[PDB]
Amino acid sequence: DGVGSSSGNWHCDSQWLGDRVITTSTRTWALPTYNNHLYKQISNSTSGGSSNDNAYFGYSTPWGYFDFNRFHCHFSPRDWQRLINNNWGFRPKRLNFKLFNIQV
C-alpha cells in the first residue's frame, strides 16, 4: 500500500473451541545481510575440521529463513498445561503465515 499505513496487526492469542485449538503468534524479527550477498562453498576444510566422521561439503547462502517448528512458538505454558491435562491427543491441521510492516 503506502509508507504511512500499517500492513498488518499484532495477533498473539489462542482460541479453544470444542475439538480445536487455534494458536496465533506474532513476533518482531530483524534480518541482516548474510555473506555479503554471496553464495559460498563451505566444508570442514573451510572450518578446519579434521575427523572423517565430521567431514562435510555444502554452501552458505545470503538468504535466511523462518523456523516456527518448536511448540513454545505456538503455545504459552498455560496453553500447554491446558492441552496436556485435558486431552488424549492432538495433531496440527492448518497453517497461516504472514509477513507485514516490513522496514528496510
Binding site: 504459552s76 505454558p77 498455560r78 500447554w80 498445561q81 491435562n85
Partner: protein, 103 residues
C-alpha cells in the same frame, strides 16, 4: 455458611416408609389400635440425575496454574480406591479453588 447454594425452594424432601402390615388380629372386636405387626423391611435402587451448568476459564495468564493432582510416588493403596478389605475411603478433603482470576 457451611458452603454451597442457598435456595428458597431447595430440592424437596423425599419421604419413604414401609406400610405397616398387621399380624393376625383377634377374632373378637377390640377398639384398640393394632400394636402387632409382621416384621418387615424393603430394599431397592435409587437414581439421582443432576444437570450442572459450567462457567469456563477465560484467563490470559501466561504461566501454568495450580491444579489438583494425584502424586506419582508409590503407596500401598491407591487414593480414592477400595481397600484390600473392600473399604472405600476418601483420603483428603478436596476444595474447588485451583484456577485463578484477577481481583
Amino acid at each position: 455458611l457451611m458452603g454451597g447454594f442457598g435456595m428458597k425452594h431447595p430440592p424437596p424432601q423425599i419421604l419413604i416408609k414401609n406400610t405397616p402390615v398387621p399380624a393376625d388380629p383377634p377374632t373378637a372386636f377390640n377398639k384398640d389400635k393394632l400394636n402387632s405387626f409382621i416384621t418387615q423391611y424393603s430394599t431397592g435402587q435409587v437414581s439421582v440425575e443432576i444437570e450442572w451448568e459450567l462457567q469456563k476459564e477465560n484467563s490470559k495468564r501466561w504461566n501454568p496454574e495450580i491444579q489438583y493432582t494425584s502424586n506419582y510416588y508409590k503407596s500401598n493403596n491407591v487414593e480414592f480406591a477400595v481397600n484390600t478389605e473392600g473399604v472405600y475411603s476418601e483420603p483428603r478433603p478436596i476444595g474447588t479453588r485451583y484456577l485463578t482470576r484477577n481481583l
